[model samples]
Target: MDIVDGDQCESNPCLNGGSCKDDINSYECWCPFGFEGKNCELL
Candidate 1:
């Protein structure tokens, strides 16, 4: 079985030991303290 592009979060785009939230065609990265930006790639 197959469909549209699945699970963008599976690659774990979020960096700096962050977390990822999956959606229909979107995603969100939740970062911890001392980190920032869309992929938690900041300090």
Candidate 2:
């Protein structure tokens, strides 16, 4: 598989009051208490 660099949050991946934290070679979505998932898209 071809892994993209930081593309996960390129289009503001975080949702529902989440924040995108950039990493060395990846990204993380910090969700609030009511959210979950890779991009905080789940409830």
Candidate number achieving the greatest TM-score relative to the actual structure: 1
RMSD list, candidates in order: 1.6, 5.3
Candidate 1, residue 5: how far the Cα is off, in Å: 5.4
TM-score of 1: 0.81
**Which residue pairs collide, candidate 1?**
none
lDDT of 2 by residue, 1-43 (tens): 8765645566777899999987766789999999999888999
- lDDT of the structure predicted as candidate 2: 0.83
Those runs of model 2 whose alpha carbons end farther than 4 Å from true positions after fitting are 1-10
**TM-score for every candidate vs. truth?**
0.81, 0.65
Stretches > 4 Å off in candidate 1: 1-5
lDDT tens string, model 1, 6-42?
Answer: 7889999999999999978878999999999999999
The all-Cα superposition gives candidate 1 an RMSD in Å to the true structure of 1.6
